[PDB]
Amino acid sequence: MAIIKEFMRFKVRMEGSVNGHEFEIEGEGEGRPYEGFQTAKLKVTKGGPLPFAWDILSPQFSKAYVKHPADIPDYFKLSFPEGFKWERVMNFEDGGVVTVTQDSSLQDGEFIYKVKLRGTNFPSDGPVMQKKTMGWEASSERMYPEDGALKGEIKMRLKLKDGGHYTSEVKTTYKAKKPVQLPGAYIVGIKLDITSHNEDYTIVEQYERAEGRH
Ligand SMILES: [Mg+2]
């Protein structure tokens, strides 16, 4: 029967560095892929506590869980079980840069995610390295087919604790491991929130809702 069930779990591992500080994270998540929501519980397993804002990592922890209207081919779901890769660059307005690569697959009944991230050039006195952030505004990820993959572009807005925001220009390329039907251009509306964290953000739970529309 259907490869992807109405309820699905995942496991994730991230290896990363930000301004040369190495860390690892392991987590697990679950959600309802056709309804477009999911939760994740992440643990810093190496390199904790992190000396920077969790918020730059949160968008790196799951595109199988986007609700898609029936007339827009669901590139992500169609790619399983083999799955898809994605690569991302986030150019923040004060010059920090985060580059990410990710592999998604369906193995032994659950999604498996492997992420590698490199952040550099965050100013030492900036909101990222000083942990002065408080979560992302809703995003519209503009998806368009290009050069045989699905490209997404976002101008993301990170809220500041004091009031105000901090901007990032994001480009992602999502590419199935086997050829799959690409959609036309469309938009994925996304909202991500940290719903729980321990004091030093070595255990973090986050909730995301995502839905495609024309
Ligand atoms: Mg299993």
Contact indicator for 103, 90 with CB cutoff of 8 Å = no
CA 28 to ligand 1 center in whole angstroms: 12
Going by C-alpha positions, the residue among 161, 183, 156 that lies closest to residue 172 is: 156
Where helices occur in 117-164 by DSSP H, the ranges are: none
CA 200 to ligand 1 center in whole angstroms: 31
CA 84 to ligand 1 center in whole angstroms: 19
CA 111 to ligand 1 center in whole angstroms: 9
Amino acid (one-letter) located at 146: E
Left, alpha or beta for 6 (phi > 0: left; psi -120 to 50: alpha)?
A: alpha
Amino acid (one-letter) located at 24: E
CA 173 to ligand 1 center in whole angstroms: 28
Q: What is the resolution of this structure in A?
A: 1.1
User: What is the distance, to the nearest Å, from the Cα of residue 160 to the centroid of all Cα atoms in its chain?
Assistant: 20
CATH numbers and ranges of domains, the chain? 1-214 (2.40.155.10)
CA 5 to ligand 1 center in whole angstroms: 14
Task: Name residue 170's beta-bridge partners.
Answer: 90, 154
Q: What's the start-to-end Cα distance of the chain, in Å? A: 29
CA 10 to ligand 1 center in whole angstroms: 10
DSSP for 157-176, written as a single string: EEEETTS-EEEEEEEEEEEE
Structure method:
X-ray
Amino acid (one-letter) located at 141: E
Decide: residue 183, CB within 10 A, 0-12 exposed, 13-18 middle, 19+ buried.
middle
- Please give the helix or strand (H or E) that residue 29 lies within, else none: strand 21-32
- CA of 183: how far to CAs of 56, 72, 112, 133, 152, in Å? 29, 6, 24, 35, 12
With helix as H, strand as E and coil as C, how does 37-100 read?
Answer: EEEEEEEEEECCCCCCCHHHCHHHCCHHHCECCCCCCCHHHHCCCCCEEEEEEEEECCCCEEEE
Peptide bond into 51 cis (omega under 30): no
CA 72 to ligand 1 center in whole angstroms: 30
- CA of 23: how far to CAs of 57, 88, 105, in Å? 11, 19, 23
| Cα gap 179→160, rounded to integer Å | 41
Q: Which residue has the tokens 């992602």?
A: 172
Contact indicator for 129, 123 with CB cutoff of 8 Å = yes
Going by C-alpha positions, the residue among 19, 98, 86 that lies closest to residue 57 is: 98
Q: Which residue has the tokens 């480009």?
A: 171
CA 109 to ligand 1 center in whole angstroms: 5
